[PDB]
Design a protein around this nucleic acid. Structure first.
Ligand SMILES: Nc1ncnc2c1ncn2[C@@H]1O[C@H](COP(=O)(O)OP(=O)(O)OP(=O)(O)O)[C@@H](O)[C@H]1O
Ligand SMILES: [Ca+2]
Ligand SMILES: [Ca+2]
Length: 341
DNA sequence: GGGGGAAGGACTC
DNA sequence: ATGAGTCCTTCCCCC
């Protein structure tokens, strides 16, 4: 198989640059302001100018300003980035019918029936980077290899404004040499579990007893990693259909008082129904983030679609249950809708 | 034994 | 110490 992965460069920040070019060359930081206090919230994405100094997605906004007090700080404009992303995704469809939109700035293309080798594959990547640059003035990084996983790794290695092929021989190299923490789907919690087994490379998963591996990291992740180490990983490029839509908002102050929470919960439903646009959910889940950043949820499935008014009443009931069955204060509250008709 | 739903968990970006 | 969404695991009802 030949997979060509497109990863939009520091997307939200770069979009802000396209709309206001004077930002070029400067450290740009797109943030989500939580509104609890002055500058509360976190960084959603920074351009490379900002990243060079350790201003990155995830850190508090306050911290970022300590490091870069004179950087441009901008609020998330999600809807804008989405409209821009949609137009780019529409460009990529010109190069394959087999295309998987993984997120707002990631797309996988099965180009097996378009190019005969990696030479032709790498050229088509150039053609794609150019096209996106011509039409939208956005840079992207293209990663190419025999499966989705290594294509992503190609792009991890080449970003930003890059392009890389990981040919058959280098896959073998990487199975032996690549730090297993850098495998897509291996986070700190799992990396830690693995290192605690001597496993630092994909190849190591082939010499450990399977039950030992499964026993610690679960059956799926084990099968996953072994298949990669065997050079047998296969997952076809599939059109993804969204499976849920939801909104979760930060409360101005923590609480377990139902009337205090209701208004935030209700705003989350309003926004969610806006987002659903024509899709009718059969399942609603209420999601709370506790004071200690734990996540608790209660949901219910219906043998029919959920109307906004049913969402409103059921959500209160589900929030109650959360309050009855857990004593902590809530920091964040929201809703998630799924099981579309 | 395992299918399917609910809730918690990890990870992605 | 934000926000959105996906897949997996555990535990339990049930066949
Ligand atoms: N921690 C985060 N919180 C919120 N949004 C995030 C976070 N990380 C990534 N994103 C979103 O994912 C999109 C792609 O991220 P980005 O392009 O910076 O990733 P990368 O440079 O490939 O690494 C961003 O435009 C941003 O909105
Ligand atoms: Ca990106
Ligand atoms: Ca990792």
């Amino acid at each position: 198989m030949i997979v060509l992965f497109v990863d939009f460069d520091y997307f939200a920040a770069q979009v802000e640059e396209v709309l206001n070019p004077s930002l070029k060359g400067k450290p740009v930081v797109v943030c989500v302001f939580s509104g609890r206090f002055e500058d509360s919230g976190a960084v959603a994405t920074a351009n490379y100018e900002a990243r060079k100094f350790g201003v990155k997605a995830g850190i508090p906004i306050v911290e970022a300003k300590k490091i870069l007090p004179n950087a441009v700080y901008l609020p998330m404009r999600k809807e804008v980035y989405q409209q821009v992303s949609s137009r780019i995704m529409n460009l990529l469809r010109e190069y394959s019918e087999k295309i998987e939109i993984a997120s707002i700035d990631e797309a996988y293309l099965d180009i097996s029936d378009k190019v005969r080798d990696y030479r032709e594959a790498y050229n088509l990547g150039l053609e794609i980077k150019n096209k996106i640059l011509e039409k939208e003035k956005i840079t992207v990084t293209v990663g190419i290899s025999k499966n989705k996983v290594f294509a992503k790794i190609a792009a991890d290695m080449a970003k930003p404004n890059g392009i890389k092929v990981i040919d058959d021989e280098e896959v073998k190299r990487l199975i032996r040499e690549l730090d297993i923490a850098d495998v897509p789907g291996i986070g700190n919690i799992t990396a830690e579990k693995l290192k605690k087994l001597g496993i630092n490379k994909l190849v190591d998963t082939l010499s450990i007893e399977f039950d030992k591996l499964k026993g610690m990291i679960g059956e799926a992740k084990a099968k996953y990693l072994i298949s990669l180490a065997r050079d047998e990983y296969n997952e076809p490029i599939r059109t993804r259909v969204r499976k849920s839509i939801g909104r979760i908002v930060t409360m101005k102050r923590n609480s377990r008082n139902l009337e205090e929470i209701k208004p935030y919960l209700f705003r989350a439903i309003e926004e969610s129904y806006y987002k659903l646009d024509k899709r009718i959910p059969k399942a609603i889940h209420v999601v709370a983030v506790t004071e200690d950043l734990d996540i608790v949820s209660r949901g219910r499935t219906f043998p029919h679609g959920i109307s906004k008014e049913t969402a409103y009443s059921e959500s209160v009931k589900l929030l109650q249950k959360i309050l009855e069955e857990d004593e902590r204060k809530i920091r964040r509250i929201g809703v998630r809708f799924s099981k579309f008709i």
